[model samples]
Target: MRNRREVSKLLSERVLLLDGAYGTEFMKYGYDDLPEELNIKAPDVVLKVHRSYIESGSDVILTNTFGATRMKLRKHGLEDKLDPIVRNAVRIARRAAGEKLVFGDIGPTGELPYPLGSTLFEEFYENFRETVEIMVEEGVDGIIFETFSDILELKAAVLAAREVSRDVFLIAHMTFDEKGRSLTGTDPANFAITFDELDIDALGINCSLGPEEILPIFQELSQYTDKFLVVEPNAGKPIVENGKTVYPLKPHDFAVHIDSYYELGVNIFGGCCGTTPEHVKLFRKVLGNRKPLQRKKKRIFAVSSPSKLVTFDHFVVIGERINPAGRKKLWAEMQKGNEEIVIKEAKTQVEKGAEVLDVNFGIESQIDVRYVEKIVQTLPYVSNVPLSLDIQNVDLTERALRAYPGRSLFNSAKVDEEELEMKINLLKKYGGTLIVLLMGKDVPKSFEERKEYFEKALKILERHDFSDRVIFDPGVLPLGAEGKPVEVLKTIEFISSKGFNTTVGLSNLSFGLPDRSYYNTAFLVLGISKGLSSAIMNPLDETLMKTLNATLVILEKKELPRAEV
Candidate 1:
């Protein structure tokens, strides 16, 4: 926390100078087999460059470990050399920086993640996890992920760093070609939504275009997130001249109009690719004592399914049909490792009215994480709405989390001690909103009793650093046999008034009623009236579907099903 706070203070107080390119600098030294090889094959060669950058007035230097991940090193037969190479690089940079900060540099895994290539999520995750662990072990002050063209690959790296420790200063940057699209087709605005949600200390764009061409990308990010933003664009695009590629932007010209970035709320400013230490010196001179731009903090509680995000500004319904709990047919198919019925359930729910599907594979003892993993992984082909990953086992939750792409809700953390802590820990490793339960062994019934447990859950989550990115489901009651049913509504209204999204198990209000769809549909209308964000209910009922449609149109979502994500 001290290092994280100090860096933010450093950013706001004055511009922090990140060192310019190690790759380009080493080339000028006339011995460039690979920049990282200098860390091993020639330690003095790498050390000389680090000392020069520090002498040139850089406040921070990066280790020459940008391509040190297992996947990126494999092409050079250096796959098994990641650990020693990264440690040696960190040691060289730290030896040069007597009192200054040295950030560990990590870049893309050099392979597109799952469904794009053959790499599963775990393989992509482990490749970066190994690199980050060694960097941390070598005592670098921070980690920077830069020049990534694919967001999923970046997510794998970011999650790995976050899982290692929550305290490190984690900065992420996605580079785009001249067309302003990542290799995976993610634009500045779209990529930032998911990137912004991670536990990184700062987020931005780095190393694609020149400073002049990267402003619009920075502008798009400021409109959404207010976190510390960093931009390190390459010194203009390289030019082919006399058979030698030359950078077009001079140091002073590259530093010009960078105040435009500060005006749009960028804090940490530096250079990339062709930028030299002279560029950093000029940037330091130009940005003298200007306070970083301040942006208002905004709340957007969003969930996603690999591609699309579903924020709770609408009356969203999570189709509750994908769970195989009470359905013998669905359970039998899942036990046989079949997902056709599960796919059909997810498909039919969305077709009727649901905007998200609630996925569960029944009891933990009988659950095969592979079955849970299979359903979460394949549902994207059948539907576009995000999934609410409903599960109880912690290991299975982690498996489902690693398999599912994009942001997802940690479908539930109950008030139970062990279960709650395990679920909160998963949420930390994989960034997502947690749908925590208000249920426990005693099963509190009154509004205040439920509030007591909810507050109890908050204390546990707070201990682990979870905040408003949560949805509280105050224990819903069975219609007649429970204490007064209005307690459920009261709990929802209380949580809604506190500005957290609230979801109710709508069918809980109709558990034993005949023609139960009527009771469920009626509760849906009533719940929305009391500031209920959404309900977990089956969309197969005509009345339930009609009620939700009416609410969406009332909220002016006459544009239904979110228009082909």
Candidate 2:
């Protein structure tokens, strides 16, 4: 197979125009509401429409095999003519476009795959392979598997096409419903990720939606993969007027909408159902003269704890007080094997403005693996924010992590080789956010050494593919403690400079010191300024609570009035 890079270069230089509205155009013929099988019986009308699109400035034309598979044709007793129909459709498209691209159109057979419904893999493969073989034999430039909802079905078609002919350009396109998700509830991110992994020539979206409805899906798609983007939106959403489905978008308006697709890094642009030559002409005219919009910045920072993520211009703090850290009373109760007190502490922290409750069960004072299971079962039902498993014990961490109801975060893995490997394994086995402290086996004394520790931690995270969900802590230390406050400031600056979301045990700075709230609040305010996203502190403390609320107002001035006590 030719590399996708070569295909993309060719596609980008010229506006790759795709064929328009096969089903809607088919309705215009005398066929009326007759089944698509009639297209094979009378190939002249189908060929005529293909000829018109080619002459009307279409660079690529799709065949009239949207429902030509044997499984679908069996309903009309035309299953036997599947090969003939597909061959004729491809031939017509090829002959109509003397030098233009001919895309063998393949649509869903309307059968769900196994574990979801009754259709078996072998049955689907046989039906699609037979149809695709004819198209390949007819000498087409490419095949477009369009309007597919089920990922399993799409994969089946892609695999079959590759098996038949590797030379042909294969584009897998899915149809999203009004909700901007596939019929099977698959979002565009999942679609792009799955398709990219399969290594298709191009991954795209087409049919079942209009330009306006596609914007959000496209925005999500932009984050998933850098594969060639393709879009063919319907003129507009279908509207019912006088018992007929009407699409309100005119040619000029559609041309304007098509421009957005180009801006979104779409290599190929065309019209779907409800489009005509005028729409294609307007699309060419508007897009032909305008330079493609420069690619916009696309960065996503995943937040597991309430930490400041500047990428989205917002703050997401994952509360850390829920964890059983330094709480001697809670530790004593858990050591006594009292599960009820643990549950009550978890509940109290959640009620105190905690978005995510970090649960730690591996206290040296209380070595109970059973508590991990107990907390997982009890807290998720009552807490609104997600939970993060905070335990040094691998087995206990995995047990709690596996039982987490939704995506959770894992807390505080050291930068040592053994601990990093263990953390990565658990991260992969049980997916969630991971917290990495800026301390390794060699604890750094100076700011530079601490920064080196952070860099090493990041490198380890990248090596394990944990960069996506990884968070960092520079190990905040208190002021007036051997002049460590200067080092703490330097550490915060280093973490912020590297653009990582960080957390500090805010109350730790006040430990073994008088007027601790003063020092704690000062550290939090400084951390927030230097991109501190989360803090492990007592949310119940009024001073700490006031500082948090005040910081929110300082950062986001618009909500200052709402930040009142």
Candidate 3:
């Protein structure tokens, strides 16, 4: 009924209300068949469910297509009915929802991508894109990807929805258990960190835990994101009464628990499983006129795998061995598109305590883009750490980023204006942190020069709301060329004092020197004192890594754990 901007303005005035459960409401309305099939098999019942919520004063009603994905429908031999099923949902919801907004509903494929399962990230993206394309073609006001247990699959669905329409209002929800973690191991804080990179309008939790159990989880999420928050906590915990599971919360009780979420700054409210139109009606009466609180969030620079999140709170090690630098065998294997060696290197480095893996496939011309994609897709299986994609070509950067399941590190973009803009755009679209090289064609030799170069890059990045996601690299040089390691330290101190993360290629300080580990160790310690946040170095070097640990202990930057006998 309103344009995107008008909808944005509307959210600021008062809290919005989403409708209650569809499948549960269907069952209560005496329809037990696949709820999605009712979109075409019984449109009248579908319209009745939607119209009831509208009459109950819901501001938004979702289309009845949560499990209508082709992957899910193929199980019922209803794959051919995908189009009509999805399109009919839009028509029916629009018919019932007249002036109210109708958001196209999407959920996970009931499958996990690689490492966790057989499906590939591209396949998952394609599946979501197909369903989303049909929904957008039918002119829904927005898209809501809800009840997803896997953040990776939810990311795929969000990316697909954005690809279909740039301006569509997109809301993403992930279901969490009673312990406040997703099934795939993403906690509330990390979930907020990872999805902060996507172009979604609102972020929240739905399904799984009931309102009382989900309040703390949503509170943690609210601290990490400034996006408009949404929550559709289940009505109540299910109890086995007389052999049938029943949710215990009545409409008034459900509304009472949901009121707590509003205090935590929830912009949109709804009920998940075991909820009905009555629950939504009570929500409107209780919170419809309340203004949404303005939430504050800190700038977090982090990366993650499906199950892990690595932040820059302490000194982080980005393993450098994945590069085909001097290893002829690894280079030859990469040329042959053999991902086994790459995967082996990834696994080994992470085992030796590499919090992040710096993946370099040599020069752009020497490697196939597909080879880069394969490595990107396969590395996550063997290692649950984030990747520092050290790709050279712009095209290869985008390809690898697309294949990556979680947020990543785009290693070292030059200070060239056009190239920096392109990389920033990629970071915004694919969702990750960017490593910006503080030099243009040649490495800056002095602290002044490097500082000038960094200022130039920051000027460009400030044009967008993206300066916080950038990791400034001071461009370390080799000792063989009379390079100044002290200048690198000075730059690191400058960047850190400004409250930004700084990373350096530690191995560069000792390039042609004997006792390279000693030099790397020394400079790394000095850099730490000067406020270095991460280093791209050899994590497998026990002496260097130990000295790093030892240095942190001595400096009181980190505490040593109790040693086992």
Candidate 4:
């Protein structure tokens, strides 16, 4: 906030101070109504708290809208206060900060993502979308989600904010019990992995535990991620002091141990429940000329469907049965807007052990892109599997990505000017694991030529500040047909040796061959030996699915019990 570079640059330079505890402090003011209602009901009281932290040298403050989502507001009958309350909450914080960054707060919906019917992803997305949109429109510098217990819920909030505005910085902090896991059984390591895959600006665990209780979990988290880390533990395990709840640790006592987190490479520091401006001031005082520890690069590239996450550490099988490619019956059903069959295919693939479902709506003049958007809309309700969107039509591709709940695979772009522009634009608006196809005019003939081309593509992506968000599809041509499987393997090995993950359309190698499943299975076996990360293929083939999963287990790329037959 003080002569800043940008909100994005602030986290890396010095340990930024997030203002202390709010909900409890509001309750301390004797408010009986909803916590979100206080933003309007007691604007002066909220202003006092913001000034308390500002005077204490905190740089970032959160708007008082933690429970401002429509679902939460509906519970308290304050849904009608949507505009004034959120806008005023942000305006009040901006008034207090002068120049400091104010982050609009979004919290968990008191709803499970699924299993009670309905795609709750949509509900949470829209809910957070409303809150974040209002907050951003009010000119808060960023959005912050804290004390969320559900990893998927946090992901929903993150994706919603990203979809709303690409330039806005966002932060995610989840609640983990003293046992060091979320109520849904996500540990610190798993939490780091999940948030790392989502590519949030910064991540951490908050609430549900005091500073002392959070140490072990924070230590475990530091080992797992290189992204900016934040720690805002409760003041101490809450205790009843004469029927008024209070945190045990005093300000200086609470701030003493933050050095442990500093040594572990945490970039942001603050307090959660039962903390005060005094707590933040002592944290700032620990300042004695220390620098952030160097962070390690995360290895795995992964994707998430609404309810599930798939890490592409080994051979990830993407179910390729949803396409209109050479299938009139599928296209006929899709044209009629009857996606029952498409939904059926998605469910079938995951049951057969496909971690990802490849969806293609590319039959000429058969299905409308809007209709396919409806089918993509319905996928999460039926399958907990991620998707590889195979359609080349940019309108159809963009539409499907918007409706899809989680991160997806964008099945491709060639070197053509218009094609690259459309695909990169889609990646910007909607985050995805893009498939870079080696196609268009100057198709390479050798490994060196292909590597040169790929590096040039990387130079272009770097100009846009993106790397490794891309995965190469080596264009696995049939061994006897287009006969470039040899060239394809060479390119895959070359990419692997240079340290990037890759995927190949498995069925492409088996096309025009006798006993195609045999060829597909053998190609995967060879590809895995070459560091292949994922494949788009038919999961309905019992022999092929079995070969893929069991082979993955044997290669030790994935665990055995996780390998479904």
Candidate 5:
């Protein structure tokens, strides 16, 4: 079977028209009640719908097997005919349009699995495997798991599909209610993140709300995942009149919504329940000759000395020179009760292009609260980058976040419930970004453990609705430590895999090492490749600065090929 990348390449050239609503199309043929069994009983009607969509400029058509799963077929006394129905659906679609892509349609099983219901995970897997295996054997171009509401159930289906056949492209589409949460209470962000980890060919939403209600959910999904987005919204809200469900969305009106979805960076466009051939034709007209919208992928949000600048396409580096964590001279100066040097260091970082200046007055001698107030007040005037207010004390985080202008980032909070909740409340009050440390009472040992910590931190942030402005650092410790650079690399990999903005103290990797600049530069390069959006590093250091500039050019592919500079 062809991959999604190949499918997308064709879609980008022009609008890849997909078939209109299957159940609605079938209803016109006088088989309204439980018509899924008709796939085997009467294949001609199903083939006719495929032919109509193809004739209406549909480049892709889905098999009329939306409810052909074994469980659903049992109601019509056709439980034993699941394989024949699913296979014939694909065969009919293929015969109707030679050489055109035919998607195998897999709908929900109508019952939740495992703890949520009577069906065990193995039963669910067997049911899904039966349908997918037949579709794969019949040579359908891809499989579309549509109208799913429960993320847990959808995950089971995905696992089942992949377990049986890994060759075919798998597209998982969820249905969201108007409130932007699935029927199972999973939000769009969580849905996208979870599916992204499954590494499916495409992830999207379909068949629940109309276009207007789907926009916000799509926007949220866009932020968390870079997978190809597919949107096939319903015609509009169904109105019941004369004991019949009537969709009021007209062809042109429905196309308007499709155009909006196209603008929002959806790669695939099609209509769901209540749509028709007329709707697909109208959508093609409005979307004629227009390129699919491209969105900025990299999101950069920084905690600066004065103002935080957040962007979704570029990296933001927090200047590391201001923190006196390991500097003996700066430590001695702070011990001598000189706040001027700290202020100067903060100002210098701003001038040197640092987007955020981290303030760590954790030293025993310089632990005065007034010193933090002094740095917060004097540093903003000389610098515009927002401040990453770093201190272990909750009281200090609260005081500085209150006094700071614009949005400030709290340096870190652990995954512990009470501590995480307290930090989230402070972030909500200050209305700024948050830096989450991937550690707790138990230090993470492996990448998986670190990932668990990150997920826990993310859930805490989500509970307080602070996930959007959150950045994570998986606690990149010294390179010489027990887990050393491997665990750190795993942490970076996990952060990148989740597609979150990330940062780390560059000096942390170089601590206790001679000629630390070499190691620091190498680690920074590696982190950037693994989606490092920001780094806490001394920007003035020549080696680090040069590496930063060079790494950006190389990683972004902006450098000239075979050119001598």
Candidate 6:
């Protein structure tokens, strides 16, 4: 078995080669019934493909279990044989691989996550967990999730693999179309940013398109993440020739196209779909004693929906009307189990220029995980924007995170040791951004005091690679209630100058003021000038929303606001 540390060191020393298509290889032997069943029914055929790849100089060989998950096996009435199939798959590869690394193969369960399909997140999580648990028990050196088109499903598999064994080497590959987006409309940047929070050793693109076509897509992925890169482009688009599916790109041409990936600092190479051992042999020759090139890493502070990515290139607006704290109508509707009001608010805010919606369901005590789950699962279908989950309770926060399919924001954790530690663990485990309140015991009221708390919080964040994944809130206060507005603006400037993004509850600053929209908008403009990255405010305030667009134009931060009659 290969050690994780040893594999990490080896990747840096030279490019590693993963094997080519197992399904296609098995088909060539006239056993296309169920390739994964070859692990138990025809173990010699599985060993032959593994040994052939090894002979062709593959450093990493994957088992024949691409569709062996219990859920997938049940489709063919082979659910009872999942354990033996997966166990046999790993052992077969181990016998053929000798000292070479054997990565247990896992793929999508053919079921889309909620809203896209009926399958829930827990269902997918449990399904992959069962498969990976068996793989680990069989002593495979690593696990590889390949040919997955949905980011959330891929996330489920990666999380399940780590749960089995964190020390095992893990690689995640997603299939993207020629346009550089997945089947579910996730672009390379969104895909890379979403997985950046997970604990995968290598991340890459495979299948869908051939090497020449996926080069630009791979380049885009490399720019967004610093993970060790891998690519497994198909031989070419499959074509029907004489009642047979064939890959047109020959072995040599495939190798020539893969040459482009070398300069882009790809750490591993392989093939998918129509690739054969001949293709793998040529890839080894093309890689020939060349060291993996170093790439400059980029840290992009962003959040994403399944389809859209919201980066902090300009000021972001988070709709704040989802809360039922003081809104009697909204609160009454919630008590009746009616969420149409919440849905209406979400749609209206997004229409009025909100990029992320702040979801709050009254106080922490009144919160139920089911309601959190409901809002998280339903909001995307209606508005399709990233959510700022404002639930403070740790368990409810987790339930919301699990229910949400995209990268979300965990709103407002205080700067205390235990509180900050708990939120950070949630972010690491589930993969999302966190909003850290720069308040220790009480809110700071002066620039000097805010600076003190910021520095203290920075020290805690320095212990982990979580600084970029965090957006700092300088702690807003009501201006009509002896609050220092200047102190807030100054704090925003200081935080921005120190290379951090900041957000504020714009409505909170205008508490107790007459014509709150006017005051809130006034404070928001000043905060933007002071480098506020986002604000949680009432998007339904037409004048305020319009003025914000106009403000961006005057400041040369935007070309123009959309025209309204």
Q: Which candidate should be chosen as best, given lDDT against the real structure?
A: 3
lDDT of each: 0.78, 0.69, 0.87, 0.76, 0.73, 0.85
**Please, what are the lDDT tens digits per residue for candidate 5 over residues 1-565?**
6766677676666556677887777789987656577787678888888888887777778888888788777767788888788888888888987888989888888885422455544465578888888988888888999988765457567777877776677889888899877765556765665456464777888887877788889888876667677888888887887777887889877888766677667777788888898888877776665666667543434332222333435767677776566677887776566877877887787777777778777473356666565455445545645667777778877656644544466788888889888888776644457788889997787788888888788877778776877788888777677647767777887777777888887888878879999988998888888778788888888878777888889777345446665
Off by over 4 Å in 5: 297-565
By TM-score, the better pick of 5 and 6 is 6
What are the per-residue Cα lDDT tens digits for candidate 4 across 137-171?
A: 88778788988876556767888887777677778
Return the lDDT, model 2, position 284.
69
What would the TM-score be for candidate 3 when compared with the true structure?
Answer: 0.95
TM-score, model 5 to reference: 0.55
Candidate 6, run of 10 with poorest lDDT: 363-372
Candidate 3, residues 418-461, lDDT tens digits: the string is 99989999888998988999999887999999999999998988
Pairs that collide in candidate 5 are 298-312, 303-386, 304-356, 304-385, 304-386, 304-387, 305-385, 305-386, 306-385, 307-386
TM-scores, each model vs. reference: 0.81, 0.56, 0.95, 0.79, 0.55, 0.95
Clashing pairs in 6: none
lDDT score at residue 151, model 4, on the 0-100 scale: 59
Candidate 3's C-alpha runs over 4 A off are: 366-368, 562-565
Error (Å) of candidate 1 at residue 63 is: 1.9
Which 10 successive residues of model 5 have the least lDDT summed? Answer: 300-309
Query: 2 or 6, which is superior by lDDT?
Result: 6
Q: Please, what are the lDDT tens digits per residue for candidate 2 over residues 1-565?
A: 1334555557867557766776676677866543355456677777777877877778778878888888888876788877777777777767787877777888888986532455654567677898888888887777888888866567668767877876778798888887767766556765665455443677788878888888778767766666667788888978977778888889877778765677677767888888876787777667764333345435454422111112224444445554445677777777667777766765677667665666775374356655555556445544544565677777777666544433456778888878888878866644456788878775556788888888887788888777766777777655545537667667877787777777776776767789888887787788778777777676667777777778878788216554355
Judging by lDDT, tell me the better candidate of 4 and 5.
4
State the weakest 10-residue window (summed lDDT) of model 4. 1-10
User: Which 10-residue span in candidate 1 carries the lowest summed lDDT?
Assistant: 556-565
Backbone collisions counted per model: 0, 8, 0, 0, 10, 0
Q: What lDDT score goes with residue 372 in model 1?
A: 70
What's the lDDT of the predicted structure labeled candidate 1?
0.78
